[PDB]
Amino acid sequence: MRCVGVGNRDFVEGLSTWVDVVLEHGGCVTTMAKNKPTLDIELQKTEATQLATLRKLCIEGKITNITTDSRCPTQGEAILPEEQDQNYVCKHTYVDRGWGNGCGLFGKGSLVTCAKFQCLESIEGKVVQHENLKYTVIITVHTVTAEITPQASTVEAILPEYGTLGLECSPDFNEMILLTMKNKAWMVHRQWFFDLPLPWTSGATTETPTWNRKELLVTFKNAHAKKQEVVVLGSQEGAMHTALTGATEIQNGTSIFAGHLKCRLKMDKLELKGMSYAMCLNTFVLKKEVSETQHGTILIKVEYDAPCKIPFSTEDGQGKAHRLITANPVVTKKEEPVNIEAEPPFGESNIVIGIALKINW
Amino acid sequence: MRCVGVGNRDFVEGLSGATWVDVVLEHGGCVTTMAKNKPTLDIELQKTEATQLATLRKLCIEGKITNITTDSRCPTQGEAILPEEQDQNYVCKHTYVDRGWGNGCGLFGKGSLVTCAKFQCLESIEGKVVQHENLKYTVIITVHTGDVTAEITPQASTVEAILPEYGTLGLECSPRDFNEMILLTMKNKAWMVHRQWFFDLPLPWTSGTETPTWNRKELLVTFEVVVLGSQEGAMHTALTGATEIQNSGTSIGHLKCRLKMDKLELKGMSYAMCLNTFVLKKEVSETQHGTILIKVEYKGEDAPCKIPFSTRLITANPVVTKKEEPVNIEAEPPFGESNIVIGIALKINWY
Amino acid sequence: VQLVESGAEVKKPGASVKVSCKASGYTFTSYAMHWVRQAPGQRLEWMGWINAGNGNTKYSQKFQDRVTITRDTSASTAYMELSSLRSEDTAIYYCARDKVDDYGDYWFPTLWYFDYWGQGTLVTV
Amino acid sequence: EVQLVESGAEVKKPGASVKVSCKASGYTFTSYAMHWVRQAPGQRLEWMGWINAGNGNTKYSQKFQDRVTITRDTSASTAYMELSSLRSEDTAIYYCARDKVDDYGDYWFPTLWYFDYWGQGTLVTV
Amino acid sequence: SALTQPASVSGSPGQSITISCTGTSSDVGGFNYVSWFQQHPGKAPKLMLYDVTSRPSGVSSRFSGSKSGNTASLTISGLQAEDEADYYCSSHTSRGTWVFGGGTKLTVL
Amino acid sequence: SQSALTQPASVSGSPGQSITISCTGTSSDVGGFNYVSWFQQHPGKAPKLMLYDVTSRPSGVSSRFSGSKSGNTASLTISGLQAEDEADYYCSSHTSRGTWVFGGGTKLTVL
Ligand SMILES: *[C@@H]1O[C@H](CO)[C@@H](O)[C@H](O)[C@H]1NC(C)=O
């Protein structure tokens, strides 16, 4: 049904009302109290609601529009209009000139090369603010979601037919930055992201951006005083993944599982359903063999009059007795089976369901 | 002409009227050799290649994942089994998952599961071996005149070259380890790296035949299953302090040689002097080493003649062959003010 | 809960067909969408499924190269595209739903999988 | 003799592309860069680009850099010029012209006697 | 097909009938993901049984199921004229796939 | 197709006289480098290189053709004009941007 079969499952009981629990992702807690229904609390989602894209780092870029300008000695340095264009990365050098290549004078003449930079593949850096954290909790009764914010810490949700439950939950994001790649995400420190050796631009959502620190992926190397060649560093994707293997990984969506939530349940106004129902007088049919759920508890699958209480009793060689994990089992329809979770009887005995089937296990 | 506009230029002269001259050639540089009554030569190292190399390894820098396969079992039913677990194309991992009625199991417990991914490489690099015997130096010898290649192997070190109309030159070169280094070849560039350094690179590799088998695939695929991504940029970063060469054989560095000009013959010594006036066809200019180039044209129906020159000549025996075709003369002027006289007339003031 | 499939199409061998499956009456992103075809007079045959919450898919080895299953969350509609069509592909194509877990993942199906089926799209090649 | 031979006259539709060839004979094809120059009727000569036959390096005029692709076949000792997205303005005679590379096979600076041999010229009408 | 069903099944109205579904230890002998679908001519299959014994709320109790080893079976008691149709069993495999039975043609005499 | 180098449209002179065709560019093409070449084109023929390196001339070219350059203007001088000299003449220059530019062309007519 739910919360059954989960390995990291906690059973918490109301003290001699209120119930204190700790929810963690991938885990479920089953709480039980005197005269109160047994419910399953599970932390479904923990999200960052709205994030601002602060930077876009370029991990793979391309080069277009290569332009060159050379001058003879005694004519000064070369000049390109593109040196002022921020789409271009440029560098000056000096090359051997003379009569042989069109100069009246022999010497080293200035040369400038500019390449137009375009990013093909990029990653994003988003900002997380503590007030935009949104935990999602789901509450289910043994045969209703509520969202929790640091702004709205206490949540009152209504469980149909059982009353209303109260949830008082209590959970440095401004000093961390969420680094987003193709579909993954990591939580890293602000300064480290700021010092990443990759060209970046600020994601103003406007196309044809202006990239800064372009020299970190485009550099120049001049060979034997007769040319200048422009090189691209290549895809820094794997370098990023390697550098981020030790950072805290989340799932991207913006689902964080690096956070737990301690809550307090108020069952004062909780009412137990089916106290005015009659008992079922007909027979139950074993739908499945009973099995043990890793915690000693046993699951009994039965199929069925009216909405009724399910008669459940434990009798030894001679003499009956009354412990159920599923509180007040009720058959709502004859067509739909019901699963019953029980605390196993110690010592071989007769487990009677109805008024009836006999099962030992 | 040649060897003049180059900044990395060496002037070596046969000492006290000698016929042999020892020089050292390096790429991007040119050497000017001169001897008494011998033509001035320009020696240049055109190419330095490694002839035939064996690709020892192939490193995978970008790979892809295809055909993910899964096998799960309920508790008390044993381990999961996939046929690909023995198949060397696949990287696999075993784990345990919570199973029960919810996932189709009669019993509640941790059931075994195996996941396998098929590895395929998208873009690769090579690690090749260079052997000292496959080195081939290419040298080019030219006569320095205003108006011939030899190949050298550590096997055939000494070369006799023919200069047309000028005789024969002797070259005794000596190539100046490759056993402990490996050449890393990428998309079109290559670097010289130590053998152990290449061997300890954390990338999946194979020695191949296509449709290969890759080793150490866990260096790019681990366990949800993830790919580490293109390690191209990481490699380029790792080689910033390396020696960049070009691959196609492969083009790589220095060469110490000895030139024997004993049998080299100088042409045009029997011509007479020109007695008419010379006309400056181009402005005289100083080279990166103090020498000056003078482009002149002769005026007067003389014959092929010696150009009267007075102040040391870099260009040996300047000769006007026709009045219509100009001649370029290179001379080394003395440091400080001096008069360059061309003819017997043009007078030029240099500093 | 209702599943609506696109109309019948007729194509020539070698072409491709793209049939749609629009969901109504339930949260589209909380259910995986499966595709099953049935040749005339033959049994049901499973082609693959898509997790509508995150786009994760998994195909049958018989259809893994020619089949592409996609989704439009804004349209709450799943798509099945079969390319390189053959005369054998003449069949009725159904879609069938199954629920995902609470974390949006689909590793193990529910026991009541394929509980709702679309009317079916006839594709003749 | 040194000779440059170009392909026959081609007539194409606007928006199409044309590939004219230039086969070199009488000299080492791999030791020379091949330039392409066009001349519209009644207009001046216009430089389109060049290809380094030794290493395949090319350089195009910024007027034609998107529509022009220059290639070479070393075994055929033949240069190729492809002009795409043809317009009626592209109606012109297309020449090839040679220039030598340095001794290292590079073509960074031309010689002073560049364009010393020219092809007969190929007429392209759009 | 990985699951084996009888080709054709017939019975008199009001009788009880059983259709078997034999697979392997990796589909039916391994997991309880055994389902039964009914397909009337021209219509889509309708889920009749799941979790071998369980049946949807809308489905009548006349349909019951059982499983032993690698063989499951759908039993229909008190046959009616509406039940004449094709019946398909299905199973989730160990390799994360789905397999269907060959189909059984149930005819009401 | 506006020329980057400027030539006179038409030039004429009596036979045997000397005539000059000018070619004005900028400090980045003609005023910057000695890559000044002169090509002769007879109508219907491919251009023929007449001068290169400003003053230098190919072996096949007569010595009557001489060249000069001053500032941003080069010049082709033809001494002793004959009827054989009638053709179109184009100056060209390697620029500072690794490009080539040609003059508009001059039609030389012998009166
Ligand atoms: C830069 O690229 C665009 C591409 O079409 C081109 O139009 C432009 O002219 C290029 N270069 C210069 C120098 O303008």
Cα A272 to Cα A37: distance, rounded to the nearest angstrom: 6
Q: Which amino acid is at B26?
A: E
Q: Which residue of B has its CA nearest to F59?
A: B325
Kind of pairing, strands B135-143 and B149-152?
antiparallel
Q: Which residues, at least 6 apart from A129, have a Cβ–Cβ distance to it below 8 Å?
A: A173, A174
The CATH number that applies at residue E62 is: 2.60.40.10
Mapping DSSP to helix (H, G, I), strand (E, B) and coil, where does residue D31 land? helix
Atom of ligand 1 nearest to the CA of A65: 1
The CATH number that applies at residue B70 is: 3.30.387.10
Cα B152 to Cα B172: distance, rounded to the nearest angstrom: 9
Q: Which amino acid is at B96?
A: Y
- How close is the Cα of D61 to the center of ligand 1, in Å? 9
Atom of ligand 1 nearest to the CA of D63: 9
Give a three-class secondary structure readout of B106-154: CCCEEEEEEEEEEEEEEEEEEEEECCHHHEEEEEEEEECCCCCEEEECC
- Give the helix/strand (H/E) hosting E12: none
Closest Cα to residue D114, out of A101, A106, F43?
A: A101
Contact by Cβ (8 Å): B251, B189:
no
**Residue ranges per structural domain of chain C:** 2-123
The CATH number that applies at residue A347 is: 2.60.40.350
Mapping DSSP to helix (H, G, I), strand (E, B) and coil, where does residue F85 land? helix
| C103 shares contact with chain A (CB less than 8 Å) | yes
Distance set, CA B262 to CA B156, B171, B319 (Å): 21, 12, 23
B35's torsion region: left (phi>0), alpha (psi -120 to 50) or beta?
A: beta
Which chains are within 8 Å of D by 3+ CB pairs?
A, B, F
Kind of pairing, strands F106-110 and F88-94?
antiparallel
Residue E3 forms part of a structural domain? no
- How close is the Cα of D107 to the center of ligand 1, in Å? 22
Residue F1 forms part of a structural domain? no
| E77 shares contact with chain A (CB less than 8 Å) | no
Distance set, CA B45 to CA A356, D83, D106 (Å): 103, 39, 14
| A92 shares contact with chain F (CB less than 8 Å) | no
Cross-strand pairs, C7? none
For A131, phi then psi, to 5°, come to -75, -15
Q: Which residue of A has its CA nearest to C103?
A: A44
How far does chain F reach from its first CA to its final CA, in angstroms? 30
Q: Which two tokens stand for residue C65?
A: 């190269």
Cα B297 to Cα B322: distance, rounded to the nearest angstrom: 9
Altogether, the residues listed in chain C come to a count of 125
Closest Cα to residue D36, out of D2, D1, D7, D75?
A: D7
Kind of pairing, strands F65-70 and F48-51?
unpaired
Give a three-class secondary structure readout of chain B: CCCCCCCCEEEEECCCCCCEEEEEEECCCEEEEEECCEEEEEEEEEEEEECCCEEEEEEEEEEEEEEEEEEECCCCCCCCCCHHHCCCCEEEEEEEEEECHHHCCCCCEEEEEEEEEEEEEEEEEEEEECCHHHEEEEEEEEECCCCCEEEECCCCCEEEEEECCCEEEEEEEEECCHHHEEEEECCCEEEEEEHHHHHCCCCCEECCCCCCCCECHHHCEECCCEECCCCHHHHHHHCCCCCEEEECCEECCEEEEEEECCCECCCCCCCCECCCEEEEEEEEEECCCCCEEEEEEEECCCCCEECCEECCECCCCCEECCCCCCEEEEECCCCCCEEEEECCCEEEEEC
Q: Which residues, at least 6 apart from A205, have a Cβ–Cβ distance to it below 8 Å?
A: none
Q: How many CA atoms lie within 13 A of D70 on its CB side?
A: 24
Kindly provide the b/e burial profile for residues E35-56, where b requires at least 16 CB atoms within 10 angstroms of the residue's own CB: bbbbbeeeebbbbbbbbbbbbe
Residue A102 and residue F35: Cβ atoms within 8 Å? yes
| E92 shares contact with chain B (CB less than 8 Å) | yes
Residue F3 forms part of a structural domain? no
Distance set, CA D115 to CA A291, D36, D68, F77, F94 (Å): 92, 10, 20, 20, 11
Residue F4 forms part of a structural domain? no
Cα B340 to Cα E1: distance, rounded to the nearest angstrom: 103
**Would you tell me how many other CB atoms lie within 10 Å of the CB of residue C24?**
10
Q: Which residues, at least 6 apart from A174, have a Cβ–Cβ distance to it below 8 Å?
A: A127, A128, A129, A130
Note the CATH architecture for domain C2-123.
Answer: Sandwich (2.60)
Residue F16 forms part of a structural domain? yes
Contact by Cβ (8 Å): A258, A48:
no
Cα A110 to Cα F96: distance, rounded to the nearest angstrom: 11
For B196, phi then psi, to 5°, come to -65, -35
Closest Cα to residue B168, out of B318, B46, B39, B21?
A: B39
Kind of pairing, strands B205-206 and B305-306?
unpaired
- Give the helix/strand (H/E) hosting E16: none
What does the angle CA B226 – CA B230 – CA B233 come to, to the nearest 5 degrees?
140
Distance set, CA A188 to CA A125, A183, A245, A248, B24 (Å): 10, 16, 11, 7, 55
Residue A78 and residue F35: Cβ atoms within 8 Å? no
Cα-to-chain-centroid distance, residue C26: 17
How far does chain A reach from its first CA to its final CA, in angstroms? 20
Cα-to-chain-centroid distance, residue A263: 20
Q: Which amino acid is at B221?
A: V
Cα C13 to Cα B293: distance, rounded to the nearest angstrom: 78
Q: Tell me which chain B residues have a C-beta less than 8 angstroms from the C-beta of A108.
A: 7, 288
Cα B73 to Cα B65: distance, rounded to the nearest angstrom: 24
Residue A337 and residue E54: Cβ atoms within 8 Å? yes
Mapping DSSP to helix (H, G, I), strand (E, B) and coil, where does residue F111 land? coil
Provide the sign of the torsion angle of the four alpha carbons A232, A238, A243, A247, taken in this order: positive
Q: Which residue of C has its CA nearest to A137?
A: C102
Question: What's the structural domain count of chain F?
Answer: 1
* Residue B292: domain span: 277-350
Residue D115 and residue F104: Cβ atoms within 8 Å? no
Q: Which protein residue's CA is at the shortest distance from atom 4 of ligand 1?
A: D66
* Residue E80: domain span: 8-108
Give a three-class secondary structure readout of chain A: CCCCCCCCEEEEECCCCEEEEEECCCCEEEEEECCEEEEEEEEEEEEECCCEEEEEEEEEEEEEEEEEEECCCCCCCCCCHHHHCCCEEEEEEEEEECHHHCCCCCEEEEEEEEEEEEEEEEEEEEECCHHHEEEEEEEEECCCEEEECCCCCEEEEEECCCEEEEEEEECCHHHEEEEECCCEEEEEEHHHHHCCCCCEECCCCCCCCCCECHHHCEEEEEECCCEEEEEECCCCHHHHHHHCCCCEEEECCCECCCCCEEEEEECCCECCCCCCCEECCCCCEEEEEEEECCCCCEEEEEECCCCEECCEEEECCCCEECCECCCCCEECCCCCCEEEEECCCCCCCEEEECCCEEECC
Closest Cα to residue C94, out of C28, C56, C30, C47?
A: C47
Q: Which residues, at least 6 apart from C121, have a Cβ–Cβ distance to it below 8 Å?
A: C5, C6, C7, C8, C9, C19, C92, C93, C94
Cα E73 to Cα E52: distance, rounded to the nearest angstrom: 8
Cβ of D89 less than 6 Å from ligand 1: no
Contact by Cβ (8 Å): A12, A262:
no
Superfamily per CATH, domain D3-124 = Immunoglobulins (2.60.40.10)
Strands (DSSP E) found in chain D? 3-6, 10-11, 18-25, 32-39, 45-52, 58-60, 68-73, 78-83, 92-100, 122-125
Closest Cα to residue E36, out of E80, E79, E74, E6?
A: E74
Kind of pairing, strands E86-92 and E104-108?
antiparallel
A95's torsion region: left (phi>0), alpha (psi -120 to 50) or beta?
A: beta
Contact by Cβ (8 Å): B253, B27:
yes
Contact by Cβ (8 Å): B45, B142:
no
Contact by Cβ (8 Å): F100, F93:
yes
Kind of pairing, strands A184-189 and B167-175?
unpaired
Provide the sign of the torsion angle of the four alpha carbons B229, B230, B233, B234, taken in this order: positive
Residue F5 forms part of a structural domain? no
